[PDB]
Amino acid sequence: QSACTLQSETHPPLTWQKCSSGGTCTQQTGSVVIDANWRWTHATNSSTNCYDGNTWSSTLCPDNETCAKNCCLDGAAYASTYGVTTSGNSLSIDFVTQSAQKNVGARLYLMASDTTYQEFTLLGNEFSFDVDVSQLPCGLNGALYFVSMDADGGVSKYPTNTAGAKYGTGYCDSQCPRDLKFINGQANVEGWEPSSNNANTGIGGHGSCCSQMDIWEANSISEALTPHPCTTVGQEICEGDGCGGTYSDNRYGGTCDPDGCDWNPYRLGNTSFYGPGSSFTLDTTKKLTVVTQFETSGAINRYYVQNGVTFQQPNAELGSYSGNELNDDYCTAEEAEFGGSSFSDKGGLTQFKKATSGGMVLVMSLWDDYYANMLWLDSTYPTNETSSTPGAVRGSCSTSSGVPAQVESQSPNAKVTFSNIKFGPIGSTGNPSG
């Protein structure tokens, strides 16, 4: 797709800190850009929409190539249309924003410049951020994660994409999302199937895969940490059900691991660690700091800070495993106890180290789940299972919670605030900010 300028594109600024082993942290100035899927897509020579509701214009978009040549992405009014605002080192995303139309959530990327994404090499480093999930009830997910996207949004690889990172192109993740309107410089009109439960989305004939590090997927009820390896580390197009993931039929027939080796304290047995109120170790009605360390062995460590008190990831006992570190032993024990083989089949933490050894783009989003109502994160899943079934209970939310239409009408003012992002060598982010 190309870019149009009927609406100016001004990326909201966002500062963050880069720390060093020497003990100092320096302020960096970046900005955020909203994903292309949320943008107005119209004809290059007019205001005629190329996509409307959950269907494409059959005249402007008869096929993927023609559609890409006839259509362009336009600018976004961050605050008024998407409910996205920034203030210093803080970023807030509103759940539902009512303007000329109804907008639900957003997916944003941290930029290095006005035309490029900031790339982070995670291996041997740690990532820290403060978050306020107090306004996120059951069914919502304020996520912060990393994906192996190209810095230019794919412009160098796909000439027909001239919008680039400036317009949030090039997304990919372990689910090999087929709901993307543009992939590899072409539209996704071929094989398009409008969603039967969402009037604004659909599924196309192609998806976009890549490694994904889910550092934070959470609400006020539950939180999970999940690395997702792929046989091909970087962004790669997939076709049909060969994509696997949520959007396809055979979930495990793809190149990526849609499940991952997840770590949810509640799912692992500690039901008093994270929750709303003073009866929980970490009170989700108050802000908290989340630190994630990527050691060179490929293992992942995590600790939290609230009101100046530090709490390491709680200890978990799963089969022959015992500890608080996400490593090979943990992931092997999880597949043995909870079932599955997707993570190991995709290479596990060893294959995932290839992703963290390279650059990954920071993503921050807020979304509700039209496929599984976020039950996999904060409830019993599958819903037919009981508490006696290992790993079935992931949170205290009712199995009837998370209906998109219901949460959107009942909790429109829900929102998430991410702030004070710090990145640097392991052991450096707790030092004085500059």
- Residue closest to Ca ion, measured at CB: 299
Contact flag: residue 306 with ligand NAG (CB under 6 A) = no
**From Ca ion, ligand NAG, none, interface partner of 177 (C-beta below 5 to 8 A by class):** none
Of Ca ion, ligand NAG, none, which one sits near residue 270, judging by CB under 5 to 8 A according to partner kind? Answer: ligand NAG
* Residue 275 is a binding residue for ligand NAG (CB under 6 A): no
Q: What backbone torsions phi and psi does residue 376 show, to the nearest 5 degrees?
A: -65, -25
Q: Residue 314 Cβ, how far from ligand NAG at the closest point, in Å?
A: 4
Minimum distance, C-beta of residue 226 to ligand NAG, in the bound complex (Å)? 19
Cα separation of 324 and 26, whole Å?
31
Stretch that binds Ca ion, among 19-27, 115-123, 247-255, 296-304 (CB under 5 A): 296-304
Reply yes or no: is the peptide bond before residue 177 cis, omega within 30 of 0.
Answer: no
Q: Name the token pair of 254.
A: 């793809």
Would you put residue 185 in left (φ > 0), alpha (ψ -120 to 50) or beta? left
List phi, psi (to 5°) of 223: -150, 145
What is the dihedral sign for C-alpha 332, 337, 342, 343?
A: negative
Write the binding mask 231 to 270 for ligand NAG: x where contact by CB under 6 A, - elsewhere. ---------------------------------------x
Question: How far apart, in whole angstroms, are the C-alpha atoms of residue 144 and residue 223?
Answer: 11
Q: Please report whether residue 272 would count as binding ligand NAG according to CB under 6 A.
A: yes
- Using the minimum distance from each CB to ligand NAG, give the nearer residue, 280 or 338: 280
Length of the chain: 434
Residues 427 and 434: their CA atoms lie apart, in Å, by 16
- 314 near ligand NAG (CB under 6 A): yes
Distance in Å, CB of 317 to ligand NAG, minimum: 9
Which of 252, 303, 311, 371 forms a contact with ligand NAG (CB under 6 A)?
311
Q: How far is the CB of 315 from ligand NAG (least distance, A)?
A: 7
* 382: preceding bond cis by omega (within 30 degrees): yes
Q: Is 280 in the site for ligand NAG (CB under 6 A)?
A: no
Q: What's the one-letter identity of residue 394?
A: R
Q: Which does residue 338 bind out of Ca ion, ligand NAG, none, counting CB within 5 to 8 angstroms by kind?
A: none
Least Å distance, CB 290 to Ca ion, is 19
Residue 303 as a binder of ligand NAG (CB under 6 A): the answer is no
Radius of gyration of the chain from its Cα atoms, rounded to whole angstroms:
21
Q: Which is nearer to ligand NAG, 16 or 304 (CB)?
A: 304
Query: How many residues bind Ca ion, per CB under 5 A?
Result: 1
Q: Tokens 């106890």 label which residue?
A: 337
- Shortest Cβ 301–Ca ion spacing (Å): 7
Pairing of strands 13-19, 415-425: parallel
CB-based contact 256:176 (threshold 8 Å):
yes
Nearer to ligand NAG, 177 or 275 (CB): 275
The C-alpha atoms of residue 119 and residue 358 are separated, in whole angstroms, by 9
According to DSSP, the residues that pair with 239 across neighbouring strands are 206
Residues that bind Ca ion (CB under 5 A): 299
Residues that bind ligand NAG (CB under 6 A): 270, 272-273, 281, 311, 314
